[PDB]
């Protein structure tokens, strides 16, 4: 060590004593490379593929091709508050798409950014000013009752029921209530999640995302979500039933004036992922889909749907939710869309449903720019190609890399709970090793490293790039580009099949560094 | 009356502003559109990127190396292996930083893909330090708990009972404790400038002034207090309010108080070297000083946002080392993306820096390799032969400043201040609402005066100015280091031309 270091140290320290320590140089289709201690290019099979980013691969020569005509033309890349009209013509895109594979005819307001996590934040900022809305006007009818239940008691006709007042002369108990109601106007919303959610790890969006250790120590600073268990949907009613919250009104009848709860809205929108990665890669059951519908049918708000990585295609459809049936009312895409080279991410939020405010409201310096605007549309031409056909290859080799995983569990159970996900979007799950017979395995299953320990087995051994997914790397995740070879998908069953051998042998020394 | 899939009231509006027009092609400090003909136009674009392209729109060297980048192979998706490139570009902009402050002082880096997301790495790590204050001074209670227990149960002290207005032993130890737990739960606080612009996500628009911008989203994150700049000596009072505190018991031999001690509820202060929600207006030494004070007593850091001021905007790569602000996190963004890319940072003191954050913080695009490249060819251009790019800023500034500040002489009925420094400048216009013409006191009443000059701008002498400020009540001009005297004197021109006719309240001519 010794000498200055100004990035990464901890990180890069904990990467070689997983046996990840390594720097690729160059990358192109499902390949990545690093240099040897001799100085060559080694090549690794990547199946982490920046997340999901790469469904099209390392660097496409189509797309590198595109990116650098778009930068000999001049490409206009700022030109903020001017007309871009390349990013109405990706919105009709996505919107054709999308009544192409639901049948439904509905129209998408098109908002873009920078991040998954910027995107699903335009969804959180619009879900609230849609409260704001729902909120003046139940505070506007509650001024009325009140002024109507104040010249009943006043006038005559009515007395105030004294019975009520637990719950809080006229005037004293008017003010009440506004004090009642103005505070609980300015309490905080929630949000809606499910267990193992991630949907960023920005200020707002990282109490979104269930991660213990990197949400715990921001609880201070943003609106919580409940955290549903989607596994058991049935609880999920009693949960947000709890959640409940009311302010307070008068209510004329006759000649009983009563005081009374009326319902207020705090749940500013619920967010699900079609194929839940923190989990692990698990899809969202019927059963599961069908109570978050009814709880966006119940509370009024609406259902983000985040396909950030399920989307441009990863499950066999463009988009996720359409597959899995998930009626959103907003949608949120990221990763594939800048073609495994630029940033770029969007939200669509329903037309009859967008307040038109926000379209001057928010606003970004990077976001909407020419360049990656132009690469949207390279991309979108090249998954709708040839009759939609892009998205059969993605179901085949999808079929294939799951039937290659389900066999490699069929003989090594013993370490192997189950295969998790659709398309090409994949995990295996571990069983636990908290528990193993190794010292060295058990001291790193219990620091919850254990995915990565055998990740850089995976690489060192076999020259394969897996990456964990899940809460205590508990998953191994396998999301390589369309374009993955039969080969290549059986070069990964020998690594596997080797790893698990060992991982049955509790073999620590070949294992652990 | 056709479908319509984004943009439909933002192009209504910049229509009737004078604004809606469509730019096909840009190069150095000049952006294109076509004409009814179908011919290229050039406007000179003063906007540029808001301030991302002090090397022009598409410079060469840029298209090419990002080019070269491209054709190599560079591997952008490489999350969770060794990426060296990201310390190269954090030990260059220290070697800058202790370069223009004489500090010493080493920072860690952690990149992202906006301002907004780097200014929330530093307001992320802010809130990592306070809960570590917190956990320390509970802890000290805890002990200061145990002892005054003690020594009440075992003889030697007795409890003082004019203490007992602030909540028997057991019974006042869990009221301070419930006390204390609550307290603790309480969001914290940011302080910030009025006109403060850092962004406008969920937390980062909370730091952000601007009222219809930030007031509809108050419910979801903390708050900023908004610290009056121009009366700093308002600035510790304000801060005084805001001073909360949590119980103990504390021991004197024979005598055990209830005694309130203070609570860090101030997770960061925020400054803007240059404000570009206030028009432009430069931070002066007294406020400087205040920030400072209020650093040192409130044991937070300070966050210097040089998303706009820096990469040699002002004169200086850090527009802070220029104005003396000696900040403990800095963020950079814009610039560094070199008008092609999306890139950020946020620098934080390495005494102050806590490892965790390596490791819990992460983003899926944040350090790619492609935008590490750019990054890498910027600091290389900014810094190249001596230093003298800096120097370049520093004349074309002054050359521009001059200009702007003859042409207020000439009209400061319609203008009453030029603002800013280097390459970041604005002249203030006055306040139209009052204004004899019908359609100009309409349009400044909707805050749209700005807007509407900028279009008079655009059509009649083909320049690209934007407003800035938050009534568009400022006219911003950040173009390239590259500007050209004759465009300056082709603007000098234009200005002296807009604000005749508004001397004038020409609203048949400035209102479409
Ligand atoms: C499903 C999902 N949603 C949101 C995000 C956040 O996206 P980004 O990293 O671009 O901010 C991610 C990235 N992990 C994601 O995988
Ligand atoms: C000083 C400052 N800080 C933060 C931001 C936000 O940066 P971005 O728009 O890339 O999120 C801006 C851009 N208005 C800025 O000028």
Redesign the pocket.
Known sequence: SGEPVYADAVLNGWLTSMGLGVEYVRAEGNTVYYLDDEGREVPVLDHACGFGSLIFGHNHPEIIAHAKAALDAGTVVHAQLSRQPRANQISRILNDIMRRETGRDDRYNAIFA?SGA?ANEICMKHAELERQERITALFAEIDAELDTAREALTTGTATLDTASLPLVDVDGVIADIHRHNDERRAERPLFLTLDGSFHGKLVGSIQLTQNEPWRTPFTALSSPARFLPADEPELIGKIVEDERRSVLTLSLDKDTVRVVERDFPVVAAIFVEPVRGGSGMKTVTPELAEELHRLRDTLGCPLVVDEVQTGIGRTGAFFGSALLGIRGDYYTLAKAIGGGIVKNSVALIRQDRFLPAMEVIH?????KDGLSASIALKVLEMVEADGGRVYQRVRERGQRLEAMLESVRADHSDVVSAVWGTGLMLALELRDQSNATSQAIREKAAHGFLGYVLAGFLLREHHIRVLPAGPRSGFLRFSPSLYITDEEIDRTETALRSLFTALRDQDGDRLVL
């Open positions: 920078n910027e606003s970004s310096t990077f976001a």
